Write a protein that binds this ligand. Structure first.
Ligand SMILES: [Cu+2]
Length: 248
């Protein structure tokens, strides 16, 4: 019952029923003219001040949540790419917040990088607040995917021709490398934005995952999490499970 654990539990419980959007930021493997662009082919560290700051935040979040009782053998390249994607994902969120003139302190958000059995690396984002309404979900997904595709093409470390960069840009948009949670439906039928409950989803689902500590990553494990209150960022796996237990 450290202050950190109690603090996170209290913060989430107060936001238990806050409606938010659920996004997933991802990428897919691409071959363009014989050039392989994989999940970790985006390792340029762009020297933009805010991005640099965000990447430092991800590094230190990893460092403080590392359990050293147990050894951690995650590939350094994998760690680097996840830190970079953390900075790029948040850059996308913040760019759209700016478009809507939303004060970042009026926003609740949660970010968690995971490794799926099938899709590999992806990043869950929960985001919402007083300036958010359900009908805006599709616009948000489209805008986030514009910025995500733009930043990925800038961060790509594969030598691409201009034609190849534009092709990659359109692939990332056309194939929806940012997804939005919707209610299950038919292909023809409309899809409605499905808002989720912020505190509940974090405590009862995201904080229950197992920490990736090896390469290749455990199926369904998480790398790293963070939130708008810096509450879950530094928690070790055991502490995260304690938060779920206390939340109940
Ligand atoms: Cu996932």
């Amino acid at each position: 019952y450290s202050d950190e654990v109690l603090g996170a539990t209290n913060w989430l419980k107060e936001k238990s029923n806050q409606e938010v959007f659920s996004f997933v930021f991802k990428n897919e493997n691409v071959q363009l003219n014989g050039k392989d662009i994989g999940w970790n082919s985006y390792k340029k560290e762009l020297q933009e001040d805010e991005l640099k700051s965000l990447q430092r935040g991800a590094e230190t979040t990893w460092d403080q949540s590392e359990d050293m009782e147990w050894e951690t053998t995650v590939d350094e390249m994998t760690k680097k790419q996840v830190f970079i994607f953390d900075s790029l994902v948040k850059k996308c969120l913040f760019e759209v917040l700016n478009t809507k003139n939303i004060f970042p302190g009026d926003v609740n958000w949660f970010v968690q990088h995971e490794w799926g059995k099938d899709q590999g690396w992806h990043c869950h984002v929960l985001i919402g607040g007083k300036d958010f309404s359900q009908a805006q979900g599709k616009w948000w997904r489209r805008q986030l995917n514009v910025y995500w595709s733009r930043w990925l093409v800038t961060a790509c470390n594969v030598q691409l021709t201009p034609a190849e960069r534009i092709k990659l840009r359109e692939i990332a948009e056309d194939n929806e490398w940012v997804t939005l949670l919707t209610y299950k439906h038919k292909q023809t039928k409309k899809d409605y934005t499905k808002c989720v409950l912020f505190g509940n989803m974090i405590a009862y689902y995201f904080l229950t995952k197992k920490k990736i500590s090896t390469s290749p990553p455990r199926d369904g494990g998480y790398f790293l999490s963070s939130d708008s209150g810096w509450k879950t960022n530094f928690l070790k796996e055991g502490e995260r499970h304690l938060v779920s237990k206390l939340y109940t």
